């Protein structure tokens, strides 16, 4: 009853009193379980340090950094079903999103391990998802502390963004890939925090592939005339200020081009995750440098203290985050 949950097929299942082994279906889930309690994680989905997520050894437990890779259901990856089954997690937590649910449900049937799914596409859902996972894992006080900070940060951002008239919303281009020529649709789980932060995302469409990465030409970016450019890849961030042709863009002239922080988890994407609680504030601070009413460096410090148990010096803020 207290241990009864609706599973991925909407059927009530009874979990063990104590979950000592758990597996997340994809990095958004695994990263979230980490900050609640890494102890029961049987594995990770991707390499702990990769192109989009850096410096983990400085921020994350040694236990987490030494976990084996078991794959997952997400872009450019596939699950290791035999290994997952062999590792005997008490429960699997999955990512409830339409482009992944079919394949996930199929494979989970084959595995025959209890599985729950959580809906994290709207970042406003993070508080309730944290509380839910706290009940599942019997880590209620920890998960509730995270949920409360999440709720506060999300409410503050919502109230701020509501104060910006629609005609005054900052035009933003999300520059992905090594050459800045991939982007996301304005409606995509890869670009959600840009819209949540009050951005007018210049490329208009609806995501129809898991990975996104819509192709856009240089000539199209010029037409879009973004006011701010948010950049994922550090090679592009250098290129856009080194190569003369990008100086046609007003954002480049005004130096309103910003590299997304990645230490230890990406602040905005690859994966989408609870980091967006902070990342969307960081984005808002860049979109609205005169109107944004909070001190972003203090939000970073408070967020890292609670979520990661890490104290950041002013030099750390510069080194890892350019803040
Ligand atoms: N330079 C980091 C990102 C970053 C650091 N400070 C601000 N952003 C990278 O490797 O992508």
From TrEMBL:
Q: Which PANTHER family does the UniProt entry name for this protein?
A: MOLYBDATE-BINDING PROTEIN MOLA (PTHR30535:SF34), VITAMIN B12-BINDING PROTEIN (PTHR30535)
One Pfam family name is Peripla_BP_2
InterPro entries from the entry?
Answer: ABC_Transporter_SBP, ABC_transptr_periplasmic_BD
Tell me the domain of life.
Answer: Bacteria
* Gene3D superfamilies associated with the record: 1.20.58.2180, Nitrogenase molybdenum iron protein domain
Q: Does the keyword GTP-binding apply?
A: no
Cystine bridges: 185-205
The source organism is: Sulfurospirillum deleyianum (strain ATCC 51133 / DSM 6946 / 5175)
Q: Where is the Fe/B12 periplasmic-binding domain?
A: 21-291
| PROSITE patterns named among the record's database cross-references | FE_B12_PBP
Keyword annotations: Signal
Gene Ontology annotations of biological process type: cellular response to iron ion
Q: What is this protein called?
A: Periplasmic binding protein
Chain coiled-coil ranges:
none
